[PDB]
Amino acid sequence: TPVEEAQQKTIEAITKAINYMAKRRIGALLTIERDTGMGDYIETGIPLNAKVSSELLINIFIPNTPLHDGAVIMKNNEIAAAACYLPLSESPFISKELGTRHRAAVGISEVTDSLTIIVSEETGGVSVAKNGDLHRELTEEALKEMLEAE
Amino acid sequence: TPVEEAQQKTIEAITKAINYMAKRRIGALLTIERDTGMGDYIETGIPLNAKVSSELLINIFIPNTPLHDGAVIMKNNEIAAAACYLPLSESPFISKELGTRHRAAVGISEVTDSLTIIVSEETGGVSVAKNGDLHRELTEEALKEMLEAE
């Protein structure tokens, strides 16, 4: 269907961007809104309401640029805003070597049903936060499976 | 009116981005559609259909990124597409030392009523192409006035 074809295009764009940033160890934080509304967090960032593309996602997260610090939040198959604030988790069960990007992802996942993707600037490792847990060191296939499952 | 205020915000976003890129010698090519529709050229680029911000404009043109080569085409208060193709002018009134961004800007200005802004990556100079003419070495004040008059 058209809806299915658009979902797969968006998944492909995300995974291509994430792979590029993982290879270059570009830190990234990308939250996909689901049933719990995230308008309060969207409003803390720079409005985009942009079509998704791997190119735009990459350009957003380039280090030392206006938009790279904070979360991209996606909603209704668009990039709603960039450089958004997310609440930092206080969970004592996050790996102790991880920093604020991962704690922000876990934090939003504790109070929403969203799915957040994180790329580590230290290692290029890819992780996903959902339901208060962080799933670390994901392969490309594993991230794809999570996006399709979501 | 709201239209008038939106125009003012868009002009403020453009001038802030251009000023930042000029200071850093970040090459840029930004075409503002007016009454001649530019769909043919928009369709050659990556679709964004994004709300304008100085932050997004800057992020687009950062060197060695997916979106930085080619033109951004704006429609009113939106960035329609990035990395767009524009025709190259053969005009003999383009300074011989100038490269493809300036020739593309003059080229589109010969077949549309659009206004195109160019930042030189060699000098940081700011120029505008309109109606087949290139006006170089613009001050911040002159650029803002040209945009307001447009």
Ligand SMILES: CCCS(=O)(=O)Nc1cc(N)c(F)cc1F
């Ligand atoms: C612009 C970065 C915001 S963030 O990525 O979501 N991290 C972050 C989030 C919060 N709430 C904070 F107090 C401090 C932070 F560094």
Ligand SMILES: CCCS(=O)(=O)Nc1cc(N)c(F)cc1F
């Ligand atoms: C991606 C570059 C597109 S451009 O900025 O409009 N420059 C350009 C434009 C045309 N038409 C060309 F044949 C070669 C070019 F380099």
Ligand SMILES: [Mg+2]
């Ligand atoms: Mg002069």
